[PDB]
Swiss-Prot record:
Localisation per UniProt entry: Nucleus
Residues represented out of the complete protein: 26 to 755 of 1544
Description of how the protein assembles with itself and partners: Interacts with FOXG1B, PAX9, MYC, MYCN and RB1. Interacts with HDAC1, HDAC4, HDAC5 and HDAC7. Interacts (via PHD-type 1 zinc finger) with histone H3 unmodified at 'Lys-4'; the interaction is inhibited when histone H3 is methylated at 'Arg-2' or 'Lys-4'.
Domain JmjN: 9-50
Record note on domains: Both the JmjC domain and the JmjN domain are required for enzymatic activity. However ARID and PHD-type 1 domain are not required for activity per se but contributed to recognition of the H3(1-21)K4me2 substrate peptide. The 2 first PHD-type zinc finger domains are required for transcription repression activity.
Binding-site residues for 2-oxoglutarate, renumbered to this chain: Y129, S210, N212, K220
Domain JmjC: start-end pairs: 156-322
Protein name: Lysine-specific demethylase 5B
Superkingdom to which the source organism belongs: Eukaryota
Annotated family: Belongs to the JARID1 histone demethylase family.
Disease the record associates with this protein: Intellectual developmental disorder, autosomal recessive 65: A disorder characterized by significantly below average general intellectual functioning associated with impairments in adaptive behavior and manifested during the developmental period. MRT65 patients have moderate to severe intellectual disability, developmental delay, and facial dysmorphism. Camptodactyly is present in some patients.
Residue stretches spanning the membrane: none
Reported function: Histone demethylase that demethylates 'Lys-4' of histone H3, thereby playing a central role in histone code. Does not demethylate histone H3 'Lys-9' or H3 'Lys-27'. Demethylates trimethylated, dimethylated and monomethylated H3 'Lys-4'. Acts as a transcriptional corepressor for FOXG1B and PAX9. Favors the proliferation of breast cancer cells by repressing tumor suppressor genes such as BRCA1 and HOXA5. In contrast, may act as a tumor suppressor for melanoma. Represses the CLOCK-BMAL1 heterodimer-mediated transcriptional activation of the core clock component PER2.
UniProt lineage: Eukaryota, Metazoa, Chordata, Craniata, Vertebrata
Length: 458
């Protein structure tokens, strides 16, 4: 067995003034951190949120994990455990595996042992992970307002930007304005780990950022790849594991896997590592691949978020989903138009950035409408796309969530195609088709002008 650890990722130690605004600090570290994919943030010494819970009243059913490299795994995904009974099982496993007290096992050893065990055929080691536990039922690790009584120690951490319940609903997040209950992007998720439990190589939905906090326990080991090397990583994984790249029926059937970072390093892909300890944050940047495993019994909380910097990458992602025939979590254009309709109450920096993305959207929509008119589609009718459930407004060909416009025919009731796939609906001549649209070009230009007036306000 031979493992050459990847170089360390950047570690930041902000002052109270720097820490005060999470969004201003993330923008400042961005030129360094986006070159490594992941980064670590150590909060000021005196920032210590209170973690308190009853281990007997907290229940969950965990996922069973087979530890095999390049073996296909489902992204979404056995008995019931309390936080106490899971902890007893987790501690007994680690101490019996090494024949040592749980806290005396070196981190370098657990790391090299993890990579040996995933590559050995004759080893059939299985573990359990309390993964993707919803904060709605289980409750957040951070303080939340309840009508229970909270203590002054919990009061100071209720309104903090670093309390992961607040981060998505702040005015600097663009996901905050989305009316639809997406669930898996504005709400925090909880992770109860044990030795060797792991997360496979992946990127976030819509190429969003992520922020992870380790509340307590043994460290979490991470591997990260910068956003610029994403397609380079994917090509390496297509040659060595082609079975993972096949077309899937929906979002629930996403195929992911465990792969040694030294294999990526050999193929000239940049990889960085970190050991995240209790009380530390890890931030993942847009389109940054990441994977990892737990050193022992621990408790973590995580959430996705989108800044103004992300907006052009978000549009590029939806275009990439269309080429791959992959489902969207939400409509990017619907989010843009929702913010434009609330221009008078938006943050000035936000209004300025939304205005620039909207200008691109309008020019692309104008070109697409001219092309479908030249194909012989003459009839048209306005349609309120936001009222339809998502599974009722997807392109038959590319599976994109339609908002701005779509094509329908009376011969196929309920079916739709996006303006890129007009020839994929039916065998009828295009004069039988109808163009369904949310807004005319005349409705769109004053919406963008409202954003300009708000952005020019000083
Ligand atoms: O398309 C590209 N876009 C951007 N960069 C490209 C690139 N290079 C990137 C670098 C930076 C390497 N450097 C290594 C150390 C690291 C660091 C670690 C830990 C702490 C700190 Cl403070 C910093 C910070 C990134 C050098 N070249 N090579 C090829 C292609 C691209
Ligand atoms: O320590 C880690 N442990 C585990 N995972 C990590 C991870 N990521 C995990 C995800 C997936 C998040 N998932 C999205 C879908 C959502 C859902 C909604 C509605 C129905 C269902 Cl069934 C599921 C449930 C949460 C993305 N990253 N990134 C980093 C670290 C870790
Ligand atoms: Mn094995
Ligand atoms: Mn992730
Ligand atoms: Mn468009
Ligand atoms: Zn389409
Ligand atoms: Zn038809």
């Amino acid at each position: 067995s031979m493992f050459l650890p990847p170089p360390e990722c950047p570690v930041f130690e902000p002052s109270w003034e720097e820490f005060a605004d999470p969004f201003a600090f993330i923008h400042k570290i961005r030129p360094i951190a986006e070159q490594t994919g992941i980064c670590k943030v150590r909060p000021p010494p005196d920032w210590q949120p209170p973690f308190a819970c009853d281990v007997d009243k907290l229940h969950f059913t965990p996922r069973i994990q087979r530890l095999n490299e390049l073996e296909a795994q489902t992204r979404v995904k056995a008995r019931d455990y309390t936080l106490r009974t899971f902890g007893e099982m987790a501690d007994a496993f680690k101490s019996d595996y090494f024949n040592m007290p749980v806290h005396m096992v070196p981190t370098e050893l657990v790391e090299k042992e993890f990579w040996r065990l995933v590559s050995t055929i004759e080893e059939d080691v299985t573990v359990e992970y309390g993964a993707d536990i919803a904060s709605k039922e289980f409750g957040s690790g951070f303080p939340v307002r309840d009508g229970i009584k909270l203590s002054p120690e919990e009061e100071e951490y209720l309104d903090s930007g670093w309390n992961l319940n607040n981060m998505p609903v702040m005015e600097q997040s663009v996901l905050a304005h989305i009316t639809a209950d997406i669930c898996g992007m504005k709400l925090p998720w909880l992770y109860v780990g044990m030795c060797f439990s792991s997360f496979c190589w992946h990127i976030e939905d819509h190429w969003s950022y992520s922020i992870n906090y380790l509340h307590w326990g043994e460290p979490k080991t991470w591997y990260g790849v910068p956003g610029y090397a994403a397609e380079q990583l994917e090509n390496v994984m297509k040659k060595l594991a082609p079975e993972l790249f096949v077309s899937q029926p929906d979002l629930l059937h996403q195929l992911v896997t465990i792969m040694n970072p030294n294999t990526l390093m050999t193929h000239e892909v940049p990889v960085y590592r970190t050991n995240q300890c209790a009380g530390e944050f890890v931030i993942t940047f847009p389109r940054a691949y990441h994977s990892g495993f737990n050193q022992g019994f621990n408790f973590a909380e995580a959430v996705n978020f989108c800044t103004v910097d992300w907006l052009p990458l978000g549009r590029q992602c939806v275009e990439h989903y269309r080429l791959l025939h992959r489902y969207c979590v939400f409509s990017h254009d619907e989010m843009i138009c929702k913010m434009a309709s609330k221009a008078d109450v938006l943050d000035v920096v936000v209004a300025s950035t939304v205005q620039k993305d909207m200008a691109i959207m309008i020019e692309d929509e104008k070109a697409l409408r001219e092309t479908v008119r030249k194909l012989g589609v003459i009839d048209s009718e306005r349609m309120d796309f936001e009222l339809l459930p998502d599974d009722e407004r997807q392109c038959v060909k590319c599976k994109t969530t339609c908002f701005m416009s779509a094509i329908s025919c009376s011969c196929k009731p309920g079916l739709l195609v996006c303006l890129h796939h007009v020839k994929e609906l039916c065998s009828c001549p295009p004069y039988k088709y109808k163009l369904r649209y949310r807004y005319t070009l005349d409705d769109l230009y004053p919406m963008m002008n409202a954003l300009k007036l708000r952005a020019e306000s000083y």
